[PDB]
């Protein structure tokens, strides 16, 4: 049907069909008369998977022969989403499978909706890991994703009377056709025990053994016949009341049972620390094993790169020391040189509550050898500080990996900087903040370690896959090469005055909005006007992200309609979606406020279809693939300095939404690429927030001087949005008034005014669309292909390659 | 190579080979250079499984069309063993696969050794279920095995310093290629709650829900293209600290985690009762569902047969009442008629400690509605007794399903008799004992319910599969038809004086003994003379089975050698094997005694290679397939009246071992078939045991009057077999002397003397072999094909059929 979805060869369609029937019969053990759509999805999934394995086997053997440097991406999160369409896209099978299934009398699109998301992550950090693997494979890097195969991913979100309800995400109920269990590569991981000192060194003894069993998932590059591997570890009990002893095996296997659902919040639970060690211990053994199959650890760093996705796998550092010193008997200094040269650290946040700070009493019990190694790392590190800044005792307490207090803690960030040759932030403003604020001391000591690597998203999933209409019209004008070289979108800049392109861009947007409006009605009985502006904020619910600021605007528009009902307003559908961490009380209250606003606004007859507020339930990767292409306005309104980068922002820029946002994270670079005129910037810059903090933030001041704001607060307090529970929202008002760490009132005025400028441009479809084109055309920098090329050249020391392997 | 293993067609071998390579590549994702033997086994297993599915699908559809009466075999145990060779045998693929793998440069036999046993049973009762499914399929019955898919089967037995050690049997570590998960047929099972009474009837409410997910395993008939189904249920938590709530899902799923390892011993644990209800509830829903796809329950019994394998699924009876009365709203009497006409009960033991007697307080909490139904069943039943035997109040307490006492108990056997149209024992002597002793009352009330169905074993696994040499030489003389009509072995009786047959029978036995001797050395470093008589006792360790009697004989031979070293004795290798239930202290002591005897006897230089005592570790189905064909002497020495049938006994008769045994269980019928002259019978009959009990059993009497016995006891007490722990065996001696329920001393004299008659016949190879031939020739009755034909015609009301379905 459409050009970018590849060829439907006569030979190929016939082959796809007969293999589909072979799998329905032999793999699923069904005939055409009893098969349900789920059987059909599985038969297709098994058919497409057959096209991978040849390439998978060839790619792994090719690395064995050429022995290139290997990249190891360690992450507790891999937010993968669905695999089927992504695989078809990267293999050029999409039209072929469309044809093949059509001739069998099936709809491939309704088959794709049966696949469960692999929701093995929380949000941005997890999804960055997924975009990264795709880009690494597309760039021919000999790269491995390593993580935990969680039995339960992020919870499924239900809304009940406006409140979030959590359900276990049982994503493996029906099997996962994409993975291959490799029980033959199972490895022991140790916990507890004690340290013995002998003549020939320290010995870690009397340990509890948990087995790590690997599952391999293929990761295909874009049309280059490279298939890399994501290896995920599962916890298994070793084989040594009888009944009770058998039942208690589930204690050891609980390690890989469930993903922790905090995003941007640290929780010091033991099961979490076990998870962190488990992935690090099993992975390092695998890494070392692979290195020995090609005595001499001097070359280790020329053969191995280990990237740490936040501090979650920070134990990689003392684990590598442990193996090198205790088991391989290298001296301390030589082992330490290998370690630093091997490891690199990526920071994703500056929020203090998000940083991992592990109680010494936990590490002592669980990992007594690792604590000793850490104390020694600390002593030697602090001796370098003392030597470089003599007499500066304050520096020494600030820089210590050990934080003193009523409970002693290890600062895992400090550990990562000390044991890594490179530390990077994820956007230029965020990397600057690291050097000026929380890592200033470390930067002054080792300025060469600090780098920027601005985040990116994959144009395969985030354009070609979710938005075939837009990719198609682009390909008509400029060709197909941009899919793996997103800088070429800049050519689109010569079509900004082209009348036919303007209509085509606007046509695709209208189509996406129609389709999504129909999805809202069918799957959720929700009833929206597709001619309204689609105002969307989707991301995890967190105070720093300021869904509340969005809420206040929404209430302002409603109060403006009620004051002057017969006046023209540009109609909006305001959509807010995201999950709250189960124990984050405020976050849960925010969700309830949003639905409470919808209860009132959506059933007011005076409003009409001019204002709708929808809470988008169970936001996840596969929902983002649907709502992003449908969006007109992208909301990125975090208090300046708090959002390290953002990646949703890039997804929307790429898909023809305009951005309203603060000068925060990657927003700064997007606006710089598109031109500030083509972006709706508002609010405090980082410098302004700083000024407000020195002086003191008094929210009362904004309440006294802004009648429209006062009215909103009065409505919240008086029970206007909760008639049965008049005092339901007193926590929010109290917080907004007395301890708002994120200064929601300070940006309110400039936000509302900036929002009027958006409504104004939207009244002029032609000028709206030309601004869209200028965004899309300059979104090229935000390809994860660019990001990974920079990691490769500036951190890992490997050259990317766009060359095809043969089939 | 050999005729009974089928054709190796040129077309077939070429096809098997290319499918093997397809699975190695696409299913296992390996190339010929990295594959291990386990990969090779899996590729073969996936290839052979492809030949089943066509037939599997056709068989299930054929039943849908013809709508025959369905047989439902309910069992908590299915002792399956390995599936690969059995599948090849039943499909005639064995030579073809042998050729195909050979040409690929593989040894099929070493590939077969990689398959784990499905050890989903304890011993005899579990294995009878497995033989039954094979026979049902071979006889074209529309039959379903229903049970629990245990995550851990019977424990793996390790011997450490002579003591049993238990290891979790993790049989699914590497996957099970034979099963097909059917998550689409998942069903809710209820526990706890309470009973509400309304106007329209009783309602069971506030229940905990556990989900039952089915796994289908194919069961192929012998060369008839029938493939039936064994459906096994797995426990799953429903989807509704967050972390802790997710972790606690393992509480509900524990139901199907582990098989209880007691054989012939009841343990009243709650997890066991949950297991029993779970299989019964999920199965009955499936049964009822299937019946509705073809309102009117009058025809239910013409469409459904439910067989209860012991009392383990006795809850089938009140569950069926519950559904029929509470959910389908039929009146009590009509529902009860349907129930009785549907259900039938098989008893497997008369040992009082083995009978299930469930505390009312457990049933009350766990299954409060079922208890009410049981009380009502009891009341109405006792009214029929009272009416038939007026004034007999004693009968009424004896017959009650409710046993009075300090703790009230439900007698599950009494329930099964009341709710069943047929009750059967498993050998003629056992069925007679039921009518005269423990079920006398019930027999007097309803004499027509009581039947015999003498057990059998499948000649496919138990001859063709494990003993291809013997099957081959039989097929040479009499053809192949006997494999599915074992009565034809009677033709062999005209070869008893044939010189060539005599040499061939003896040749096969020598070959089996050589092979097994080499297995003992390779896998266990054990060092035996293959020219010695192979004296084997293999079965679970239980006092009633009298491994101890065997022990005393062994010690007697040793003391006879030491007394007169230079005298000729027929050399023996005495092999004893079996598992002990983990909490059965005595049973564990017996294992230690056996190895203690081996420690002394095996390293005495005066003994030479004249007497060896070996403990066969980890006895299980796949070990029985090896040792049975190698046996000369089969030991079946249970105290008369205690072994209901036995089935090992039949395995040995079939494979050319002679039997030494008591007139117990099926021993009586075997000796009757072969002629008493061709059997080594000894010891008390049932009548003699009875006489001894009336008088009182005083073991002291045998100790005073038999010097050889006194010497053994003195040796046991003085520490002759335990020099470091002189008093190690005082529990055994104490038991033997003061409270031996099984009268080991009473049979000792006649046992020893009968054992001398065996040594005598063994000195004359020609006459030994002719007696073997007379056993093999009359072992036909003991085919499970005969057994099932009798169940079908006399209990289920269906006609067996030997006719082939088409391929
Ligand atoms: O716990 C975290 N979870 C999370 O998703 N991140 C995000 O990581 C993303 C990837 O770098 C950033 O774009 C984003 O600004 C940042 O909040 C940062 C964390 F620290
Ligand atoms: O718990 C039991 N386990 C067991 O294996 N059985 C056996 O069941 C076999 C099958 O009927 C009989 O041959 C045998 O005599 C009998 O002991 C009987 C029981 F009651």
UniProtKB/Swiss-Prot annotation, chains A, B:
Domain of life: Eukaryota
Modified residues (Phosphotyrosine): 192, 215, 443
Modified positions (Phosphoserine) in chain numbering: 3, 400, 484, 717-718
Matching SUPFAM superfamilies: UDP-Glycosyltransferase/glycogen phosphorylase
Changes after translation: Phosphorylation of Ser-3 converts phosphorylase B (unphosphorylated) to phosphorylase A.
Site, Involved in the association of subunits: residue positions: 97, 131
Residues the entry annotates as binding AMP: 31, 64, 289-294
Annotated InterPro entries: Glycg_phsphrylas (IPR011833), Glyco_trans_35 (IPR000811), Pyridoxal_P_attach_site (IPR035090)
Main EC class the enzyme belongs to: transferase
Cofactor(s) the protein needs: pyridoxal 5'-phosphate
Record PROSITE patterns: PHOSPHORYLASE
Ways its activity is controlled: Allosterically regulated through the non-covalent binding of metabolites, being activated by AMP and inhibited by ATP, ADP, and glucose-6-phosphate. The activity is also controlled by post-translational modifications including phosphorylation.
GO CC aspect terms: skeletal muscle myofibril
CDD domains referenced in this protein's UniProt entry, alphabetically: GT35_Glycogen_Phosphorylase (cd04300)
PANTHER family linked: GLYCOGEN PHOSPHORYLASE (PTHR11468), GLYCOGEN PHOSPHORYLASE, MUSCLE FORM (PTHR11468:SF32)
Subunit structure of this chain's protein: Homodimer. Homotetramer; to form the enzymatically active phosphorylase A.
Protein's name according to its UniProt entry: Glycogen phosphorylase, muscle form
Source taxonomy: Eukaryota, Metazoa, Chordata, Craniata, Vertebrata
Gene: PYGM
């Amino acid at each position: 049907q459409i050009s970018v979805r590849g060829l439907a060869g006569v030979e190929n369609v016939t082959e796809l069909k007969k293999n589909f029937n072979r799998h329905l019969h032999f793999t699923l053990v069904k005939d055409r008369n009893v098969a349900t759509p789920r059987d059909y999805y599985f038969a297709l999934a098994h058919t497409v998977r057959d096209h991978l394995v040849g390439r998978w086997i060839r790619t792994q053997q090719h690395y064995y022969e050429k022995d290139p440097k290997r990249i190891y991406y360690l992450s507790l999160e891999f937010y993968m989403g669905r695999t089927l369409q992504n695989t078809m896209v990267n293999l050029a099978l999409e039209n072929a499978c469309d044809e093949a299934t059509y001739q069998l009398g099936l709809d491939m699109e309704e088959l794709e909706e049966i696949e469960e998301d692999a929701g093995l992550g929380n949000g941005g950090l997890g999804r960055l890991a997924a975009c990264f693997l795709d880009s690494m494979a597309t760039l021919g890097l000999a790269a491995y994703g390593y993580g935990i195969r969680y039995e339960f991913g992020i919870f499924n979100q239900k809304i009940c009377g406006g409140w979030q309800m959590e359900e276990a995400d049982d994503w493996l109920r029906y099997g996962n056709p994409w993975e291959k269990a490799r029980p033959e590569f199972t490895l022991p991981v140790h916990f507890y025990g004690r340290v013995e000192h002998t003549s020939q060194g320290a010995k870690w003894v009397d340990t509890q053994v948990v087995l790590a069993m690997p599952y391999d998932t293929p990761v295909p590059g874009y049309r280059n016949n490279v298939v890399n591997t994501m290896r995920l570890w599962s916890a298994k009990a070793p084989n040594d009341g009888y009944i009770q002893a058998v039942l208690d095996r589930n204690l050891a296997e609980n390690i890989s049972r469930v993903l922790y659902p905090n995003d941007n919040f640290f929780e010091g639970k033991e099961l979490r620390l076990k998870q962190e060690y488990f992935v690090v211990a099993a992975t390092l053994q695998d890494i070392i094993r692979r290195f020995k199959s090609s005595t001499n650890f001097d070359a280790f760093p020329d053969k191995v790169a280990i990237q740490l996705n936040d501090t979650h796998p920070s134990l990689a550092i003392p684990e590598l020391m442990r193996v090198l010193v205790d088991l391989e008997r290298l001296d301390w200094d030589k082992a330490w040189e290998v370690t630093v040269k091997t490891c690199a650290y990526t920071n994703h946040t500056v929020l203090p509550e998000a940083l991992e700070r592990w109680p010494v009493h936990l590490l002592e019990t669980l990992l007594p050898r690792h604590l000793q190694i850490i104390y020694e790392i600390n002593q030697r590190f602090l001796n370098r500080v003392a030597a470089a800044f003599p007499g500066d005792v304050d520096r020494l307490r600030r820089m210590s990996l050990v934080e003193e207090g009523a409970v002693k803690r290890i600062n895992m960030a400090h550990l990562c900087i000390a044991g890594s040759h490179a530390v990077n932030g994820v956007a230029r403003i965020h990397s600057e903040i690291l050097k000026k604020t929380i890592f200033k001391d470390f930067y002054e000591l080792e300025p060469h370690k600090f780098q920027n690597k601005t985040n990116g998203i994959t144009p395969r999933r985030w354009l070609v896959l979710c938005n075939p209409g837009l990719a198609e019209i682009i390909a008509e004008r400029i060709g197909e090469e941009y899919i793996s070289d997103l800088d070429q979108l800049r050519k689109l800049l010569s079509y900004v005055d082209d009348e036919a392109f303007i209509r085509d861009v606007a046509k695709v947007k209208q189509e996406n909005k129609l389709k999504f409006a129909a999805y809202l009605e069918r799957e959720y009985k929700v009833h929206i006007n597709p001619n309204s502006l689609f105002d969307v904020q989707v991301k995890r619910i967190h105070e720093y992200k300021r869904q509340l600021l969005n809420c206040l605007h929404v209430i302002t528009l409603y109060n403006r309609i009620k004051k002057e009902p017969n006046k023209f307003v540009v109609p909006r559908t305001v959509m807010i979606g995201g999950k709250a961490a189960p124990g984050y009380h405020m976050a849960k209250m925010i969700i309830k406020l949003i639905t409470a606003i919808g209860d009132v606004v959506n059933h007011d007859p005076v409003v009409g279809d001019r204002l709708r507020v929808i809470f988008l339930e169970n936001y996840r990767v596969s929902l983002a693939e649907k709502v992003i292409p449908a969006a007109d306005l992208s909301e990125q309104i975090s208090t300046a300095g708090t959002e390290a980068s953002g990646t949703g922002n890039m997804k929307f820029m790429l898909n023809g939404a305009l951005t309203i946002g603060t000068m925060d994270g990657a927003n700064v670079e997007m606006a710089e690429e598109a031109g500030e005129e083509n972006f709706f910037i508002f609010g405090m810059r980082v410098e302004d927030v700083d000024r407000l903090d020195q002086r003191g933030y008094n929210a009362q001041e904004y309440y006294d001087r802004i009648p429209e704001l006062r009215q909103i607060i009065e409505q919240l307090s008086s029970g206007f949005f909760s008639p049965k529970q008049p005092d339901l929202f007193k926590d929010i008002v109290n917080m907004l008034m007395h301890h708002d760490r994120f200064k929601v009132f300070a940006d309110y005025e400039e936000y509302v005014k900036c929002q009027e400028r958006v409504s104004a441009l939207y009244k002029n479809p032609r000028e709206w669309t030309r601004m869209v084109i200028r965004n899309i055309a300059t979104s090229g920098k935000f390809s994860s292909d660019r990001t990974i090329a920079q990691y490769a050249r500036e951190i890992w020391g490997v050259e990317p390659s766009r060359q095809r392997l043969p089939a």
